[PDB]
Amino acid sequence: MFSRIRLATPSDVPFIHKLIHQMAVFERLTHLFSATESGLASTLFTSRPFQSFTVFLLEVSRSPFPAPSPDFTPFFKTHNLDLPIDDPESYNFSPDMLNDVVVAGFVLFFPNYSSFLSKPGFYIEDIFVREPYRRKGFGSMLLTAVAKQAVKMGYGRVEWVVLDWNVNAIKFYEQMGAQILQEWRVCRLTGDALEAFD
Amino acid sequence: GSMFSRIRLATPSDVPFIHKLIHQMAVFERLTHLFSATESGLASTLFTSRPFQSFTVFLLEVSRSPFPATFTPFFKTHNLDLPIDDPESYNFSPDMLNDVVVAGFVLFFPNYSSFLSKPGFYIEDIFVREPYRRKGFGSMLLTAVAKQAVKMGYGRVEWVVLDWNVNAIKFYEQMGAQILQEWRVCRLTGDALEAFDQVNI
């Protein structure tokens, strides 16, 4: 199985929306899933890669790949597996049924900033791999792509959050040399509280 | 004789003042050993997008004379009559023709949820120089970001707080912020980040 990581464009909006759908189902967040295709598409038309909302898509194919910003070329990795992958929804994630290319995952990230370094960084909002393609290295590949891109661009940090009880995730992040800056707490002003500011 | 104040967008000419403000913040926080910010770094990173599309700075400025109309909220400041002891005012004056002094800043940028239709803002820093504190300026800076979010149809404003800073937590709760207690910040930096460049993808 061949794999490639590439920047999403507006034509990828349906796949990204379906990936977020699956993610919301898995994470039990469907009640707050209000993002729309047209909202996503607007953002993808509006956003300069790496300077705003950015998506990398992971695609897989049984045949090799051909090989949207000055600062990027696609990442690649071949795999091996004569295990059948049962993916009956593959058609819903395929930009090309002639060549059997299937979207298997994504990462959504955007720039943050270290005032102390005067350097941008990246914050990873989400990494999602569809269930049939898990435990094959793809999620790690998506994280790697963001890290590599940061280094390429001279960015200072890559950050994200973890659930304080998710010991498996914590250990994984620590193993790759991430630090858990465990005293900070996220604060959020939304809804009527936010609207009160006028 | 009241002090007048305004909040305005930083432009490239403000780079020296932003540098000095971050430096003072590092001094106040006793983290000067971690400060390696440069003017050229600020200049080349802060102004690559239009305001509000990426990194955005609002500056707080004060004057003993009024500001002509050209992001200052509803002007709810106090202690404006008090003498200012500001020996560094010369270092924070954008124009020696006038008596305008830069007194603080907020640095923020868009964030995004996968699930929710609207973007938000994340606030990286709010700092008011010591001589100008307890006049409402810091609250005004936070207010300016919140009102900008409402104006642009953004759904949330976020930041972090230290878990032991009960006074700050109570202040945020008083304005209706929630503390999302389950999350921990993870950070890949330095050699651990650089190590990823060796991965052949």
- Say how far apart CA B184 and CA A144 lie, in whole Å: 20
- Say how far apart CA A159 and CA A56 lie, in whole Å: 16
For residue B73, the number of C-alpha atoms closer than 13 Å in the C-beta half-sphere is 24
Residue B23's closest CA among B132, B123, B125? B125
Interface contact A144-B199, CB threshold 8 A: yes
- Residue with structure tokens 């949820």? B113
Interface contact A189-B34, CB threshold 8 A: no
- Say how far apart CA B28 and CA A66 lie, in whole Å: 54
Q: Which residue of B has its CA nearest to A24?
A: B115
Q: Which chain A residues touch B199 with a CB distance below 8 Å?
A: 144, 148
- For residue B198, is it left (φ>0), alpha (ψ between -120 and 50) or beta? alpha
Q: Is B172 part of a structural domain of the chain?
A: no
Q: Which residue of A has its CA nearest to B57?
A: A115
Q: Is B179 part of a structural domain of the chain?
A: no
Domain count, chain A: 1
- Those residues whose C-beta lies under 8 Å from the C-beta of residue B136, and which sit 6 or more positions away, are B76, B77, B78
Q: Is B187 part of a structural domain of the chain?
A: no
Q: Is B84 part of a structural domain of the chain?
A: yes
* Bridge partners (DSSP) listed for residue B122: B109, B158
- Say how far apart CA A59 and CA B73 lie, in whole Å: 48
Q: Is A110 part of a structural domain of the chain?
A: yes
Tokens in use for A28?
Answer: 């039990």
Interface contact B117-A34, CB threshold 8 A: yes
Angle between helix A13-27 and A37-46 (nearest 10): 120
Interface contact A189-B195, CB threshold 8 A: no
Cβ atoms of B22 and B45 closer than 8 Å: no
* Bridge partners (DSSP) listed for residue A7: A56
**Domain of B49, in residue numbers:** 4-164
- Say how far apart CA A11 and CA A122 lie, in whole Å: 24
Q: Which of A91, A133, A155, A173 is catalytic?
A: A173
* Strand-strand pairing, B183-189 and A157-163: antiparallel
B46, B114, B148, B154, best to mutate vs chain A, most A CBs in 10 Å: B114
Calculate how close chain A gets to B57, using CA atoms only, in Å.
Answer: 11
Does A140 count as an annotated binding residue? yes
Q: Is A116 part of a structural domain of the chain?
A: yes
Indicate if A173 belongs to the active site.
yes
Interface contact A115-B109, CB threshold 8 A: no
CA B23 to chain centre: 13
Calculate how close chain B gets to A20, using CA atoms only, in Å.
Answer: 7
Q: Is A169 part of a structural domain of the chain?
A: no
> Beta-carbon neighbour count of residue A67 at 10 Å?
8
Residue B7's closest CA among B148, B144, B128, B139? B144
Q: Which chain A residues touch B156 with a CB distance below 8 Å?
A: 188-190, 194
Q: Which residue of B has its CA nearest to A160?
A: B186
- Say how far apart CA B197 and CA A7 lie, in whole Å: 19
Q: Is A45 part of a structural domain of the chain?
A: yes
Residue B22: which H helix or E strand, with range? Answer: helix B15-28
Cβ atoms of B124 and B107 closer than 8 Å: yes
CATH number of the structural domain spanning residue B21: 3.40.630.30
Q: Strands, DSSP E only, in chain B?
A: 4-9, 56-63, 101-111, 120-128, 156-162, 178-180, 183-189
- Residue with structure tokens 């976020």? B158
